Amino acid sequence: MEILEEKPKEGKVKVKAETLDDLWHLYHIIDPGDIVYAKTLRKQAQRADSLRAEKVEVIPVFLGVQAEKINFHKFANQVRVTGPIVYASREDVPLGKYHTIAIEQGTVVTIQKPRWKEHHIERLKEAVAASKRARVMIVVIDDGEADMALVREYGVEILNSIRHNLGGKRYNTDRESEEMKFFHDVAKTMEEVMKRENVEKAIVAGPGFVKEDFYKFLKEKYPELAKKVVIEDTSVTGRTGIYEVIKRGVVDRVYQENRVAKEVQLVEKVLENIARNNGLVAYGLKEVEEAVNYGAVETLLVLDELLKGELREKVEELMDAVRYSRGEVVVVSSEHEGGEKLKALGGLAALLRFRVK
């Protein structure tokens, strides 16, 4: 999510929800014996005659609701918490009732009167405020400027806004030795960020020749880390040029799928060929549980549905123990050509380094 911690005791926190998993985090922290303040709206009901007729109303503003049940609802993406009111504006005198509310995006405050644990504060901060990433690494390289951004759901910022200070062709021919210098610089800065953030493509886009010109230079300089040119729409630069490149560009979503998918099926093939080798395949709750404890699992491949199974705890632990042992754990769509076989296999497949019986 995006977190701001406004009070060193967590008497004021300011939290948000952007994605499904954020809510699952918010669920996991919130218990009985908390009050969440927020900023909803609860209406009245009034008035009436001597008897009963028709008429209703509404109001706005914040509040707080006590925790009495904690319920989690699908096709809504909303964690309801119900029970009694204890904070409102009094200008109308509307106290004397209960009031459900849902923790969402926008401000949600959380506090615990007997005072939070280490695990609780940790869980919050587990989801990273800046950006957990998806790619989230887009460039736009036009004659007037070079730009390069990190656009996450949790917030949005052009990382470099460096200027060429030069034309494409308008000042003279501009095929300078200070253009050769410039492009080398551009490539370097992008290369260092791309690696550091660990998402491996950028989309170059631009007018006329320029976009192409640059890709050619990148391939020629050094072998790439994966680069693609897409035409996209550009005819502006700055925050709105980068923004326009992203909007009509389902490129971001589609590429991120293809990269994950690749990793599963590469590993998939390997599991086939290892199954023949005696004692190096693990698979099958017992067997896998047995390698993971002895710390010999190289790779753990599990379909994401098994993480959200009915046993969820074991799965996470097996992954947690492997990641600590410096294996890599792969979490992957079940739509994929590799993902569908991890259903069939049963759920867990792991590649060992050395034999566990």
Binding site: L285, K341, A344, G346
Partner: protein
Amino acid sequence: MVRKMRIAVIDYDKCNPDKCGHFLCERVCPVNRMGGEAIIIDEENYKPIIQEASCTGCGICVHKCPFNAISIVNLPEQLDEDCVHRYGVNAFVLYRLPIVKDGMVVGIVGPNGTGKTTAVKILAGQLIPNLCEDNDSWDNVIRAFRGNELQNYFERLKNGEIRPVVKPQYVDLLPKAVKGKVRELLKKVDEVGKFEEVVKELELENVLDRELHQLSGGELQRVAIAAALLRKAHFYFFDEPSSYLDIRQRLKVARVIRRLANEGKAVLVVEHDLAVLDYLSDVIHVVYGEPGVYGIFSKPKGTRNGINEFLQGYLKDENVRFRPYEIRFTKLSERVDVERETLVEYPRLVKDYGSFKLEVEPGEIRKGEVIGIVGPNGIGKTTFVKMLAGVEEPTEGKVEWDLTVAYKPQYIKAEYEGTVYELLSKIDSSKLNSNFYKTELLKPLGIIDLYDRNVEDLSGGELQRVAIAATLLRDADIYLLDEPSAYLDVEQRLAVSRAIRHLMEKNEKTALVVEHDVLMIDYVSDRLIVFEGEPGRHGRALPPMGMREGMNRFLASVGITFRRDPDSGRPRANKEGSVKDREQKARGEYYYA
């Protein structure tokens, strides 16, 4: 779109839980790994059972089975609704049936063990279809086949006003079950009042004097053909009548069976020789699947199209591939026919037992070639073959030289205690373990899967393949096979052809294959020995001669000319009295490859 059922068949006759550990299945099974019941143990009958309701069809258990007692297939859910009979879960299943018809000859082509014979029992009143459910009545059968001509069959079948007579898939049961003569028998079984016509057309008037056990192959077979027609029945089902008949016989028996259609009687026929099949049938069925897991009969076709489609391996009516390459043949212009080195030469021999006479003209044997022997039975094809084989000493002449001869006898009977692997292994362990004999002989004839049963515990078609393979794994200069054709199917017949051809050509060795099935001759033969005279009396073996010049020479004494089909390439037999029949016979070229 999607839709899919999993179907598991386990050939239990191949499973042995104690040899693979403890049911390697449930152990290796992913679903069972994660606390599931894909594979369950029948701890009583001691067998494994796959609950298709689970099995993801991942196929791990299949790859693991130390033998190959497991098959798991993923169906599109369609054929499954046309399911006819299941022998119990993890057991053979039939889909669909052959559609028999009155006054017509309904053909069947397709490899053994695909429940050709399952369908016969179904139709014979002796097995009620469960329709892969739990049924034990006719009525659900009659409904299921609503929109089709077989409803009418099951209604009559239940009133029991028709009963089909069946010429069994193996014969040589009547000699050890029915004693006394062919003369006698044929009076006894008589009920059709057509005794005269039958015995004469199938030429068993000399064959009456002998007792059943004293018959040769051709004769025993034909005597069954006779005794089936003299039993009273409208519906006659012949399973493999091509067994041990010679080239002259099989064409003449075909005419006899065809004349039934004219009498308005319903013939249902299995044949494995495309020329004989073309000639008899008027409808044709293709049967596809891998043996012992499932069989499905296709839709009825007009003979010609049906055969074309079998060869292509692709069904355009049903949209099914069932063999990933095409049936093909060898002309004489698709070879190098160049002369090779003389291995040995034989002078004039003449053998007279005093109950048959043979004269063998002077002849050359060349090394590196495959000589086909042709002629009608009892013409001493066998007398020649046996003189080189050492079981018979020539009366005059010499053939018995310092060539070692490898001899596959005419009948097959077992006398061997121990397994298929014992029997082969003592001949040449070495050959068994080399990649060639594995690509060409052993693997496509099923022998890898057969090592677990005893020789005596093998059935006719498996045991035939086992005899054949045995003879060619003997260490010999020259290979003698007397009539391997018997009880082989179309695919098997062809596989044996490709195996003989490759093995003989590669090590440049001689083999003699006494032959009568048109297709094997058409592929394998480099040279030919045509036999003539009057059978049962005298034979005159004419020297070896070219494949074409031989089939020309011989075909002219049978009246029957052969073309080359234009649809996809196969030997086309031409009807006696046709355009092509007349053009070939007038122009002294009686054959084309």
